[PDB]
Design a protein around this ligand. Structure first.
Ligand SMILES: Nc1ncnc2c1ncn2[C@@H]1O[C@H](COP(=O)(O)OP(=O)(O)O)[C@@H](O)[C@H]1O
Ligand SMILES: Nc1ncnc2c1ncn2[C@@H]1O[C@H](COP(=O)(O)OP(=O)(O)O)[C@@H](O)[C@H]1O
Lengths: 191, 596, 596
DNA sequence: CATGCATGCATGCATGCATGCATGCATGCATGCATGCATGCATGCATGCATGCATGCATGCA
DNA sequence: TGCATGCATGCATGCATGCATGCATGCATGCATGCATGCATGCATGCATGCATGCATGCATG
């Protein structure tokens, strides 16, 4: 009962390569989206806009300089719903967090998430004290704290949003790839 | 493992499927084209379903037993023949359904008299398509991802509609928390889906009795067969009359019925829908190519369209040209320029005025006879929907909406009130209809060709008093109509003689060849204007402004737009690609008889 | 369709099944022989199952994961490997089961300590076969004929025992009146059937503690594995410990257990069952063929059997010959003529009398040590069954019954009462046992070889008083025994010297080579008497009647029957096919030392 | 003064009885579950009212 | 005296207004069924009382 199917779609190395493209981008002073993420960390913007062209520009870039990249345009193009949160939890790995002292008149939403950030860490600071005080490298000592305490989930304190953006035919005119997402289609054409 | 019965229906039909090689090349062309369809889509950049028409002819001359078994209990012979057919598809190189085309006098009965007899049989029903429901897709195969194990899964769902055999129903709940406790995260895209539709069919009104309550049944469609019909046509339906459901014996009448396993065939009406399904052989077009190499065939086609009517030579010439329709060139980011031609005639009664009208209707394609009033929904849709599924507003396509790319037959034009005449300025000039009621303001397209017929105001006074105001019509309606034909009441004896032997021989090259020659010219004969087309009509149109105004009125630049259309449609008849000066020589003469 | 998991266990094991080609030639020989088995049965006129031994060796040196998965949860790796193995059977040219041979220190525990731990695992259990149930066949596939339609049908039935996975149970009632109302007339023969058996296994008494209540479990067998064990042996069992049944949670303890998917291996005891599974290589028999080409190997084999005992040369010579057993020629429609040889010895105590006995036991095959009394079931079966399944009488095979084709070791023969001595005349002479109690009179076969040992009546007086009545035994028992050896108490110093250094070097060619040489001679070395065998013993036996009666007594013609056996067994040692005069020259000397 | 025979007595084992102990058959008793109905909510069809328009009639003008 | 123009009046084409009609749903009532208890039945198992066997003794034997 309830069998299983293997498929060529992976979730593992795609999450690895999507971390690198989210970090390593220089073309359009320093990194593009981290300065945007610092602007998100500046707490003055709510949207995150992701194209498909810099992806395809990166996918042109990796094959010409390195051995092989996993395809990621047509990967997102197929299912496109699991790519929302599996992409967005990789964003919260790297963040210039304290980049500005909080304003007193900034946001009533902002003062709540600052608590749940801090209440998470103060609760985290308590449990690591009791365990070292009752002994019998500290990574496992860190790991014991990880599973013995109920926490707020990281899905609960986000404050931002992410919208995708379809690719134009213009860069697809240079290198033809899976440009099927952007055609002026009809409701009658919606099979 | 199958029994002996199942393979015998296979091998007997496989014997028939090996008997006739005509269907072999059919599926061959299906596979080669769809291979080439995917070949061009996947080589430079870097549709068709699976069903084959089988007639009801050959089964009688092959197996009268297998003939008979289908026509009574189809639920035993349809599955193995398809399984054998999918064998042929896999052996020579997915459902792979069929048609069962064929005429039979067994079960071509009315749906009005269909119920409680011939149940669980295959019945051919025709009638009216009405109240078409919404197109929904159907869930079949669910896909689930488990987080920690990192694998996918597999799960299907079935319903009793498709299988055609009463199998033991095994419902399955949509899965969550399957084996150990990992969350079954749902996915999409790879989960497969198939569209679905259900419609109702009313019987034929021409077959119906004088007045009684009509009764109807329902038809559910399948994947490649969703949405072939708009509501309001005449369609033959061939399928199997199946009754499902527990008829009230569980705990006042059950056993509601339907028809599945269907093929859909829209058929031509008198005044509704497409009649352009007429084939053209190479033997056919070779006759047309032999015909078009002549020099006087416009005369022969002119004289052809009066099979029982004496005279009216120059009137018939335009009736060729309206069905030609002119050329359409929509401007780059501007507006369209109207190409069709609209004519009103006038004359004294009993002078072949009503002897012209149905001849215009029956010979042409997609015509609607509009008589008397046209109130509240001829030019409109009126948006009256009180749809019980949800509070919303939809449209019911009116006749002027419905007659697109066609002809509108207007009878007794003078009796029309001024109300719908507001819409006629909108229809005839901008080729669009915008309906703005409080529910939804709309905008649609209709580029119909128009022929109307009005009487004189009083008596037969067509020439006596004055040529102006024999009609007393609004002023722009003069500018709307292109040619205004006046038929006299000339009393003679030589003319009476030509009337005499004509009607006497009446009561004691062809039409079906004609409409083949007509509809062929639409998709390949549009011409383009040349330098010689300018020089005559520039000299000619100045004469139309300088001296016709000394005789009659009006002369607008809109008249010159019709001068383009007449030379346009004349080149369609000769099937030329350029435009010759002779086309203008024909077109110049057409204004003289129409006016002077 | 299978998932990704199921094919991966296949392709990984298919990688192993392609890794080692030794099992490839195994199944090849299975198919070729059974093809040739059906070839000879179906060409002139006008058995073997499907399982292959796989060791537990190579899986550790190939896949430690697939090693581990079997040893914990076997219910996931056993089905796909067999499916892959049936693939190999179908690809190179029906269950096709396996063995899982192999020694492992993981789960070779006692059944006494087995319960509630290691459930749903594969456990190797050894112990005692007891209370074997009856052999029943099992119904699988029913066949039904309908009269009027004239066709057959198809119907199967399954149970939870075979499948090893908990599948949804779907019971089906045995069919009658299927579709329309034709009588489902039953048939047979083509309906398939498979035998079935269940048995219980008690643990080892040698492994058991001193005294406590023994506890046991049950084993159900399969088709080719029905009835390999009689009740009363020592058998290793390798299978999977499975618990079925709803453990009392439906409406005080459920969850009764059993072991399925089994292989059966009978193992040698100290005094029970077969030990003839010893192999013979071509390297082995070439040594035997090099050995048998000599002239004095009877002496070397005589001196070999006293590893720690001084003297007794002519005694050891006969102990070779009893294990040879003589020849058996049953007459045409007459009676058998007895071929084995039975010897009693007598002597003073502490003179290697008890130093002989277990050496006779351990070196030989299928021996039973019988000590003291033999009351009520040694020579008998006693028929005591109070079988709860039905009122009936069965047998429990006694030791004299059980020791067929073997040796019976009788210790302290003089202390036996006269009761069982009645049976000894029946056993030693007619080679049969007939038991006639009020339930069922019976008759069975037992042709055991007998060695007994009695003491003198009083003191060590072996030579002093008279040679007659040092035993005071019944008269026919003199005639029952073949040679009567008398061991003296000779006191010397040279003889004491040979005793001296023998025991001193004791506390500070071979046996396993020997029993290979013994059991090989049984199935191919029987000889046939020649003309030269008559002429000596005719002259010799007359001397045995004319002059031995002037010295001792008795001389019967039964003594001449032993004279045949001695020359018979001597030819078995030299592996000759004829009988030489020298065999009689050996046999003539054997009577002189035994008597005079 | 040293053995053999007839005589008498002590004692362990075979078994046909009395009795306790496993499957089916039967009957009284109490817990739980499918389901039709009274009720409420959402929706389509038909009539009176305001009225632009076509028509008949009164009017002066050539 | 005949004709064009302005004024009074019926018609039926859209907005308010009334009511009949169809569909979703939570609850009280009836009935199939598991479960406790004791029985007639069928069959395995312990037991005690008297006979043949072993040993001591009186008598006879040589
Ligand atoms: N030129 C003609 N040749 C033959 N028949 C004619 C001709 N003119 C009139 N008719 C007759 O006139 C009849 C049609 O009258 P029609 O003028 O069409 O009606 P209406 O004037 O009322 O629209 C036909 O039956 C036809 O026989
Ligand atoms: N000829 C011999 N050589 C070596 N050991 C001997 C010999 N005769 C007797 N023995 C010793 O005698 C013992 C066996 O005594 P045995 O005569 O068998 O017992 P019983 O006479 O009671 O049946 C053994 O331990 C063995 O050491």
């Amino acid at each position: 009962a309830l069998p299983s199917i293997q498929l060529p779609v992976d979730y593992n190395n795609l999450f690895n390569e999507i971390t690198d493209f989210l970090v390593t981008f220089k073309q359009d002073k320093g990194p593009k989206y981290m300065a945007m993420l610092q602007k998100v960390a500046n707490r003055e913007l709510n949207s995150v806009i992701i194209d498909l062209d810099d992806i395809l520009q990166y996918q042109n870039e990796k094959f010409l300089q390195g051995t092989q990249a996993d395809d990621l345009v047509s990967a997102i193009q197929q299912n496109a719903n699991h790519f929302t949160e599996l992409f967005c939890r990789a964003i919260d790995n790297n963040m210039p967090l304290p980049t500005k002292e909080i304003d007193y008149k900034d946001d009533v939403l902002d003062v709540i998430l600052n608590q749940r950030r801090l209440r998470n860490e103060r609760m985290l600071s308590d449990r690591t004290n009791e365990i070292r005080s009752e002994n019998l490298m500290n990574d496992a000592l860190r790991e014991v704290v990880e599973d013995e305490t109920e926490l707020f989930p990281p899905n609960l304190t986000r404050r931002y949003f992410l919208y995708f953006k379809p690719l134009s035919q213009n860069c697809a005119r240079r290198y033809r790839k899976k440009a099927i997402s952007s055609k002026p289609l009809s409701v009658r054409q919606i099979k | 493992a199958p029994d002996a019965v199942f393979g015998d229906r296979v091998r007997r039909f496989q014997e028939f499927l090996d008997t006739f090689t005509s269907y072999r090349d059919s599926v061959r062309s299906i596979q080669v084209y769809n291979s080439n369809n995917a070949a061009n889509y996947n080589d430079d950049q870097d549709i068709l379903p699976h069903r084959i028409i089988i007639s009801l002819d050959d089964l009688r001359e092959f197996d009268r037993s297998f003939w008979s078994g289908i026509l009574v209990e189809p639920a035993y012979f349809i599955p193995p023949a398809e399984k054998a057919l999918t064998d042929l598809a896999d052996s020579m190189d997915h459902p792979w359904k069929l048609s069962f085309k064929g005429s039979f006098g067994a079960h071509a009965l009315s749906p009005r008299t269909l119920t409680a007899q011939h149940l669980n049989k295959l019945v051919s029903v025709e009638g009216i398509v009405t109240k078409t429901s919404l197109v929904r897709p159907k869930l079949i195969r669910s896909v689930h991802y488990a987080a920690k194990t990192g694998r996918f899964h597999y799960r299907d769902y079935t319903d009793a509609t498709t299988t055609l055999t009463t199998r033991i129903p095994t419902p399955a709940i949509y899965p969550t928390e399957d084996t150990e406790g990992n969350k079954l995260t749902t996915e999409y895209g790879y989960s497969t889906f198939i569209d679905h539709q259900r419609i109702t069919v009313q019987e034929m009104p021409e077959m119906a009795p004088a007045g009684q309550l009509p009764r109807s049944i329902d038809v559910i469609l399948d994947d490649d067969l969703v949405d072939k019909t708009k509501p309001g046509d005449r369609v033959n339906v061939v399928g199997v009359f199946k009754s499902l459901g527990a008829g009230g014996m569980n705990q006042l009448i059950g056993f509601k019925t339907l028809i599945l396993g269907n093929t859909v065939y829209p058929l031509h009406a008198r005044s509704t829908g497409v009649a352009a399904r007429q084939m053209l052989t190479d033997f056919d077009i070779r006759n047309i190519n032999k015909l078009s190499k002549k020099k006087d065939i416009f005369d022969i086609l002119s004289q052809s369209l009066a099979p029982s009517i004496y005279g009216h030579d120059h009137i018939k010439k335009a009736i060729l040209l309206m069905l030609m329709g002119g050329v359409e060139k929509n401007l780059e980011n501007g507006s369209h320029l109207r190409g069709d031609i609209n004519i009103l005639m006038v004359g004294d009664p009993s002078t072949a005025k009503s002897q012209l009208l149905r001849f215009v209707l029956n010979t042409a394609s997609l015509a609607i006879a509009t008589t008397g009033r046209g109130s509240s929904g001829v030019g409109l849709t009126a948006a009256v929907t009180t749809d019980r599924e949800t509070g919303e507003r939809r449209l019911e396509a009116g006749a002027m909406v419905l007659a697109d790319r066609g002809v509108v037959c207007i009878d007794e034009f003078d009796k029309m009130t001024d109300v719908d005449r507001v819409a006629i300025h909108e229809v005839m000039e901008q080729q669009t209809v915008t309906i703005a009621k409080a529910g939804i303001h709309t905008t649609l397209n209709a580029r119909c060709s128009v022929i109307a017929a009005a009487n004189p105001v009083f008596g037969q006074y067509d020439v006596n008093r004055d040529p102006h105001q024999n009609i007393a019509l609004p002023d722009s309606l003069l500018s709307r109509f292109d040619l205004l034909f006046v038929v006299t009441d000339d009393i003679n004896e030589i003319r009476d003689r030509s009337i005499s032997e004509h009607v006497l021989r009446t009561h004691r090259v062809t039409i079906p060849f004609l409409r083949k020659y007509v509809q062929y010219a639409k998709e390949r004969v549009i011409p383009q204007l040349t330098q010689e087309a300018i020089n005559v009509i520039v000299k000619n149109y100045t004469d139309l402004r300088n001296d016709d105004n000394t005789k009659k009125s009006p002369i607008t630049a809109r008249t010159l737009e019709t001068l383009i259309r007449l030379a346009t449609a004349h080149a369609k008849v000769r099937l030329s690609k350029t435009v010759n000066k002779v086309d203008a020589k024909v077109a110049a003469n057409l204004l003289r008889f129409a006016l002077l």
